[PDB]
Design a protein around this motif. Structure first.
Motif, PDB file in Angstrom:
ATOM      1  N   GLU A  52       0.798  -1.222   0.000  1.00 55.27           N
ATOM      2  CA  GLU A  52       0.000   0.000   0.000  1.00 55.27           C
ATOM      3  C   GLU A  52       0.833   1.275   0.000  1.00 55.27           C
ATOM      4  OE1 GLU A  52      -2.807   0.099   3.127  1.00 55.27           O
ATOM      5  OE2 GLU A  52      -4.465  -0.517   1.820  1.00 55.27           O
ATOM      6  N   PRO A  54       3.910   2.074  -1.360  1.00 53.38           N
ATOM      7  CA  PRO A  54       4.349   2.510  -2.688  1.00 53.38           C
ATOM      8  C   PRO A  54       3.204   2.650  -3.680  1.00 53.38           C
ATOM      9  CG  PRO A  54       4.793   0.196  -2.437  1.00 53.38           C
ATOM     10  CD  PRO A  54       4.338   0.694  -1.077  1.00 53.38           C
ATOM     11  N   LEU A  55       2.072   1.988  -3.474  1.00 50.78           N
ATOM     12  CA  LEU A  55       0.964   2.171  -4.398  1.00 50.78           C
ATOM     13  C   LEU A  55       0.413   3.588  -4.253  1.00 50.78           C
ATOM     14  CD1 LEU A  55      -1.383   1.558  -6.390  1.00 50.78           C
ATOM     15  CD2 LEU A  55      -2.551   0.492  -4.474  1.00 50.78           C
ATOM     16  N   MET A  58       3.096   6.250  -5.697  1.00 52.73           N
ATOM     17  CA  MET A  58       3.044   6.294  -7.155  1.00 52.73           C
ATOM     18  C   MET A  58       1.808   6.991  -7.745  1.00 52.73           C
ATOM     19  SD  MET A  58       5.730   5.388  -8.421  1.00 52.73           S
ATOM     20  CE  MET A  58       6.958   5.555  -7.133  1.00 52.73           C
TER      21      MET A  58
ATOM     22  N   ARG B  28       8.941  -3.312  -1.633  1.00 53.31           N
ATOM     23  CA  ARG B  28       8.420  -1.957  -1.878  1.00 53.31           C
ATOM     24  C   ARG B  28       8.745  -1.483  -3.266  1.00 53.31           C
ATOM     25  NH1 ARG B  28       8.484  -0.390   3.792  1.00 53.31           N
ATOM     26  NH2 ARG B  28       7.645   1.726   4.054  1.00 53.31           N
ATOM     27  N   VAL B  31       7.286  -3.060  -6.177  1.00 51.26           N
ATOM     28  CA  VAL B  31       5.942  -2.564  -6.408  1.00 51.26           C
ATOM     29  C   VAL B  31       5.979  -1.219  -7.136  1.00 51.26           C
ATOM     30  CG1 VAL B  31       3.757  -1.964  -5.392  1.00 51.26           C
ATOM     31  CG2 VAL B  31       5.188  -3.777  -4.369  1.00 51.26           C
ATOM     32  N   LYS B  32       6.851  -0.315  -6.678  1.00 52.29           N
ATOM     33  CA  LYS B  32       7.030   0.978  -7.347  1.00 52.29           C
ATOM     34  C   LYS B  32       7.309   0.818  -8.845  1.00 52.29           C
ATOM     35  CE  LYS B  32       8.620   4.387  -3.922  1.00 52.29           C
ATOM     36  NZ  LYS B  32       9.390   5.664  -4.092  1.00 52.29           N
ATOM     37  N   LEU B  35       4.453  -0.458 -10.931  1.00 56.79           N
ATOM     38  CA  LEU B  35       3.508   0.637 -11.178  1.00 56.79           C
ATOM     39  C   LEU B  35       4.038   1.696 -12.172  1.00 56.79           C
ATOM     40  CD1 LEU B  35       2.213   0.872  -7.534  1.00 56.79           C
ATOM     41  CD2 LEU B  35       0.726   0.544  -9.517  1.00 56.79           C
ATOM     42  N   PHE B  39       2.108   2.643 -15.568  1.00 57.60           N
ATOM     43  CA  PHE B  39       1.855   4.021 -15.996  1.00 57.60           C
ATOM     44  C   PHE B  39       2.468   4.345 -17.360  1.00 57.60           C
ATOM     45  CE2 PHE B  39       1.495   5.378 -11.303  1.00 57.60           C
ATOM     46  CZ  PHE B  39       0.152   5.062 -11.309  1.00 57.60           C
ATOM     47  N   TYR B  51      -6.414  -0.597  -7.339  1.00 57.46           N
ATOM     48  CA  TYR B  51      -6.291  -1.184  -6.021  1.00 57.46           C
ATOM     49  C   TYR B  51      -6.544  -2.685  -6.037  1.00 57.46           C
ATOM     50  CZ  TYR B  51      -6.279  -1.599  -0.963  1.00 57.46           C
ATOM     51  OH  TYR B  51      -5.959  -1.926   0.330  1.00 57.46           O
ATOM     52  N   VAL B  54      -3.626  -4.597  -7.938  1.00 59.65           N
ATOM     53  CA  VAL B  54      -2.429  -4.778  -7.125  1.00 59.65           C
ATOM     54  C   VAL B  54      -2.698  -5.754  -5.969  1.00 59.65           C
ATOM     55  CG1 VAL B  54      -0.842  -3.612  -5.569  1.00 59.65           C
ATOM     56  CG2 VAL B  54      -1.491  -2.550  -7.721  1.00 59.65           C
TER      57      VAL B  54
END
Lengths: 91, 98
Positions: A52, A54-55, A58, B28, B31-32, B35, B39, B51, B54
């Motif tokens: 959550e 880093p989500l 971003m 972390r 995940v960045k 994403l 994008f 949401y 992920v």
DNA sequence: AAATTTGTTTGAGCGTTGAGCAAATTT
DNA sequence: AAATTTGCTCAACGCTCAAACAAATTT
């Protein structure tokens, strides 16, 4: 066919995508290894926080701070979003 | 005696750095990056399930790996995950883990 | 044979949700 | 100055939860 991927490099310097879920799998495989059977307690919340943060980071960046757009992109209620943001000291 | 381990170094992943050297980085960051690349290719539709996307993407292997670790034992699995046993059974059904 | 686990219902309460509106901010 | 966003209420409906038990299973 798979939307959330990360980049990897092999020993030939070839770059190849790999689903994020394999990263999660690896990280857990490692975690479980490093503890010779000590006990685990809130694995759901640990992984969830790790994901959550880093989500949120971003999407807030991608929408320039616009919580409305963020909430819409994410499919969650705007109050919920404000909640999660506060939870992580992101406001 | 004990070196601190911050929460982002608990779940980590092997990477290669700018010096051709293997090194752990936080989940972390995976995940960045995922994403970021999501994008990057979002030219240029609208999105409204990010949401749950992920969430599924991360719940599935978590459930996978814990059921492997507790060798099928749902009670233990729920226990280490810190959620209720009914909701664990629910999530398992959601991802066809039965 | 005992201990544990599964599968299943309870109903208590916490959490997501939309809507709505004015002050603030951005366009 | 118009349009959007923000911060903040509320109470419906959904979800998570502990506690029960019998049947099935693991030990």
């Amino acid at each position: 066919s798979d939307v959330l991927t990360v980049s990897t490099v092999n020993s030939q310097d070839q770059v190849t995508q790999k689903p994020l879920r394999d990263s999660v799998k690896q990280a857990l495989k490692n975690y479980f290894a490093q503890l010779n059977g000590q006990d685990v307690n809130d694995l759901y919340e640990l992984v969830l926080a790790e994901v959550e943060q880093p989500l949120l980071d971003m999407v807030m960046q991608y929408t320039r701070g616009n919580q409305t757009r963020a909430a819409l992109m994410m499919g969650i209620n705007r109050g919920t979003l404000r909640k999660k943001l506060k939870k992580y000291g992101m406001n």
